[PDB]
Design a protein around this motif. Structure first.
Motif, short mmCIF file in Angstrom:
data_model
loop_
_atom_site.label_atom_id
_atom_site.label_comp_id
_atom_site.label_asym_id
_atom_site.label_seq_id
_atom_site.Cartn_x
_atom_site.Cartn_y
_atom_site.Cartn_z
N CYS A 108 -53.33 8.89 48.72
CA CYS A 108 -53.37 7.57 48.08
C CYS A 108 -52.34 7.48 46.98
CB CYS A 108 -54.76 7.29 47.52
SG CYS A 108 -55.94 6.61 48.72
N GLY A 149 -54.94 3.46 42.64
CA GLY A 149 -56.23 3.87 42.10
C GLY A 149 -56.54 3.13 40.82
N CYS A 156 -59.54 6.88 43.31
CA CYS A 156 -59.17 5.99 44.41
C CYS A 156 -60.50 5.75 45.19
CB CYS A 156 -58.12 6.66 45.30
SG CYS A 156 -58.71 8.17 46.10
#
Ligand SMILES: CSc1ccccc1CC(=O)N1CCC(F)(F)[C@H](C(N)=O)C1
Ligand SMILES: [Zn+2]
Length: 139
Positions: free
Chosen positions: A52, A55, A110
């Protein structure tokens, strides 16, 4: 200030670790600004295992959470302090956002869980020490 409590572990910024943390040392890395110590009580934070680049982090100097886009973990140069000489910090992710010294320890998350903790910043930027590669924290 701030820590990640996962299983029998406590993850903190190495520059802010206590005498207890050092007397119950599991692992530490100055180049990452991380220190992991053992705990008797069971921690319930979930660590993310992802790639990811978005976040939300907690910013204590504003008592607020902010959404951020962040870079992939890398070696970034960091200026001298009472904690470290001038050096490259590894496993660091930068984002455009507010931070002040005192914000270190704030968690970044996240949808998959805990990504890392605030470790550097300044000039409208904020740096996070990544923890997603430490697979032994879950096991
Ligand atoms: C959120 S930290 C921040 C934010 C705004 C402005 C300045 C700072 C302070 C900062 O970047 N430092 C001092 C503490 C430290 F642990 F040594 C850091 C490191 N990981 O090497 C570098
Ligand atoms: Zn994720």
């Amino acid at each position: 200030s701030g820590a990640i409590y996962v299983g029998n572990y406590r993850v903190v910024n190495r520059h802010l670790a206590t005498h207890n943390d050092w007397a119950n040392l599991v692992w530490e890395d100055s180049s990452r600004d991380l220190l992991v110590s053992s705990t008797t009580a069971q921690g319930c934070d979930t660590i993310a295992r992802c790639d990811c680049q978005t976040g939300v982090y907690y910013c204590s100097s504003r008592r607020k959470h902010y959404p951020v886009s962040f870079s992939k973990p890398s070696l970034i140069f960091v200026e001298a302090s009472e904690y470290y000489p001038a050096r490259y910090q590894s496993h660091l992710m930068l984002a455009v956002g507010h931070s002040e010294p005192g914000d270190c320890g704030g968690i970044l998350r996240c949808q998959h869980g805990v990504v890392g903790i605030v470790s550097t910043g300044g000039n409208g930027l904020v740096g996070f020490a990544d923890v997603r590669d430490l697979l032994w924290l879950d096991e």
